[PDB]
Every structure is written in C-alpha cells, then in structure tokens.
C-alpha cells in the first residue's frame, strides 16, 4: 500500500509555467486502444511493438509499448492482448507515423466480461463532495492507466481539469483503493517551464492492474487561493 502524499509532495499547478495543453492532450479524446492484438516486433528488451493504426487521423501505424522490466515484455510477447493507453510522440524512439506509450496491456483470453461493469469515481474539491460519475469497463482486470484516463477525460470535458494555458485547480491526485491496498497518482505537472510527457507517462510502465469489481476511485482536488 503506497504511502499517502507527504506534506508539499503534490505538484502545484501555479508552479508550472509552461502550457497546460501538453498535459491536457494526454487526457483528451485521442488515445491508443486495440482489442485482441499480438505484438509484431520489439526494439529493446522491455518493449513490445504492435501494428495498431490510427486510421481516423492518420497519426501512427504502429505503437511501441514500454514496460518497467523484461519480465513484462516477455510475458506479453506473443499473447493476444488488449491495449489501452495515453500515447506520446516527442522523443518517441523505435531505434515517422509512430507513437509510444507505457503499460496498458492486459491478456485478452479469460479477461472479458459479458457485460460492462461500472466503477464510481468520487470527486472532492477542497474536502467537499463535488460530483460522482461512473466509468465503465468490460475487463475483469483493468489497468489503473485505463481507469485514470477515463476519469480525467471526463473531468477535462466537464470540469476543465486542464485547459490550454492552465488549470483551475492547484493540486490534484487520484487514489485507487482495492480491498486493503491503495495507491495514487499526482494529476499535476512537475514545477518549471516545460512538461516532459514521456517522463510523466512512465509512471504507467508498471502495468499496474486492479479488479474491476473491487476497485474504488477517489479524486481529491484543491482550488487556487
């Protein structure tokens, strides 16, 4: 179970002076999604390459999935999987219609539900009940990444969590609770004048999964004073 945020650990959006658009895009409509696909290549020992194509916008013909270790790449190489992630292009390396992401891979066979399950997201602002809504999945075991993306995607659209130039919130973190264990991600960029998408998204490279029946989601936002 992950230690909760230490005092002053959470990133403050006011200390980020670059453009918040570079965070927003990661949780806008476009993302990598493929169902029942199998890897076709590999660059380095901790990645897998899939022939997942963006036919709608034409932005990529292949996706490189990066994991934290060799064991994860080996586990999924040659398995039929589902892929779901927030992808990036700047400093995406395959050695030009390519994209990279971290984690987001679940075995297909035996992981499918026959109906969608709902997971309630509870959102708090300055300690108060702000709103709640449901995200849905048809996976028994679903990546935290997929649930985080679905959660933030809603909050961008409906609460302007990220706007092109800034955020209306000072801090935010999303906490996942599964039985006796929890963990969380900071929703705001690191302080300074540039946002490193690759470095941010690398947090998902553990391929962390949760049980879609058991998992609960709480989002804690604080407003700028």
């Amino acid at each position, epitope marked *: 179970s992950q*230690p*909760d*945020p*230490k*005092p002053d650990e959470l990133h403050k959006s006011s200390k980020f002076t670059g453009l918040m658009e570079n965070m927003k895009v990661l949780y806008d409509d476009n993302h990598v999604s493929a169902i029942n696909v199998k890897s076709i290549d590999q660059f380095l020992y901790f990645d897998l390459i899939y022939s997942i194509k963006d036919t709608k916008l034409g932005n990529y013909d292949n996706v490189r999935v990066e994991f934290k270790n060799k064991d994860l790449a080996d586990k999924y190489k040659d398995k039929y999987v589902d892929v779901f992630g927030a992808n990036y292009y700047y400093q995406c390396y395959f050695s030009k219609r390519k994209t990279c992401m971290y984690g987001g891979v679940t075995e297909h066979n035996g992981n499918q539900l026959d109906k969608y399950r709902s997971i*309630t997201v*509870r959102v*708090f602002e*300055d*300690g*108060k*009940n702000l709103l*709640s809504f449901d995200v849905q999945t048809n996976k028994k075991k679903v990546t935290a990444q997929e649930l985080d993306y679905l959660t933030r995607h809603y909050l961008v659209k409906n609460k302007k969590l990220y706007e092109f130039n800034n955020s209306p919130y*000072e*801090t935010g973190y999303i*906490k996942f*609770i599964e*039985n*006796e264990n*929890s963990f969380w991600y900071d929703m705001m960029p690191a302080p300074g004048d540039k946002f490193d998408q690759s470095k941010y998204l690398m947090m998902y490279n553990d391929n962390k999964m949760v049980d879609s029946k058991d998992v*609960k989601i*709480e989002v*804690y936002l*604080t*407003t700028k004073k």
Partner: antibody
Amino acid sequence: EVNLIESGGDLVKPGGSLKLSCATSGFTFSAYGLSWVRQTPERRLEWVASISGGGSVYYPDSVKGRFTISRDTAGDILFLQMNSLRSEDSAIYYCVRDLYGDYVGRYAYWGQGTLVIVSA
Amino acid sequence: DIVMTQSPATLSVTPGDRVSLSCRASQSIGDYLHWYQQKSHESPRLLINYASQSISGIPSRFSGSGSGSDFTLIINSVEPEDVGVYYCQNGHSFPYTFGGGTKLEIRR
C-alpha cells in the same frame, strides 16, 4: 496505527472560551480531512467543524463565528478554539479523520473524546 | 438543513435475526450516507460508507442499501455484541447532519 487523542475539555462559565487539542499519529497529517464532531447529553451527534487537506474550513451556522478549527502540520495537532460558549455546547468533543483522503464528511477514525461542560 | 430520521428509534431483537434499520433524509443525498455503530463507553465506529460500500475490518454481517432519501442498514444474524446505538449521517452537503440513532437491545 492511526491514533487521535483529544485534550482540553473543562468546565467553563456561559460566555467563556476554551481551546481543544487533538494530537494525532500513525498517518500523514496533511493528507486527510479532519473534523470535530460532538455528542450531546441527549446522545445526539453533531458536526462542529472541518478542515480540508488544503486548509479550507467549514462550520455549521450554530458555531460559525464562535468556533475556529486550525492545525499545526509540523506538530500533527488539530485545534478547536471555542468562544462565547453556550449550554448547548456542552458535549463530548471528538476529533475525527477521513477514511482515505481529502473528504471532510466521513468519520473513519475517532479519538476517545474530551468533555466540555458549560455551566456557572 | 437535511434532517435525518431513524425510525424505529428502538429495537429489541433475537440473536440470529436479520435486523433492518431505517434512515430517511428530508432531501435527496444520492448515496452520500454513512453508518456508525456506537457501543457503551466507546466512540462511534464507521460501519458502511456511501450507503452500501463496505469497509475493511468490519464484519460481513453488516450491509447497507439505498439512494436518494431512503436507506437501510442490515445486520444479518445479529449477535450479543451488536448491542448499541446505530447512527446514519448525511455526508452529502453542509451542514453535515446525523440521524437520532436507533438503540438496539438483544433478547436472552
């Protein structure tokens, strides 16, 4: 692991003042919603004050402008300053912490409570 | 303010009974409704959060249901150690408010 220890309860004359303290341990003090809830002689529970992780404070109308919730993050101590005390303020005062995080309306951990008596 | 009503305010039950305790809110609070047990000489203890969501450490015989204005706590096969006062609580909006409690006593 989580522990909350209230102190400062006393007998005070109507119109007097008292400051309560809640010394905490076993968790990151700034990461949770913290509140005071009181239990009256009639056994009713009443929400008295809340402070969010970011320091936003909230009160019911019955204590607004008389009570002040505050904290000392470095000391892991939560306070309740009570002014212009009334007989209706006589109660056991408990310090409480949220179950998971920065929500102030869910009381998962309670102290043993400290007794306040308002009478001449 | 949102007034929380617990009625019956007292129950006398037989060990092994399935016991149903009622809480009603004067305005809708969605599922932002939490339940507490208080035993003699102890502080209250959180049993259920968000109407029906169970909490690590609480015995399985405790469960909850409802959304909006009408809520129920169920003790499935009540035990002698369950005697005490059960409170519901609006955690939806300010002021946070508690029900008056239902006092549970057991037969022997």
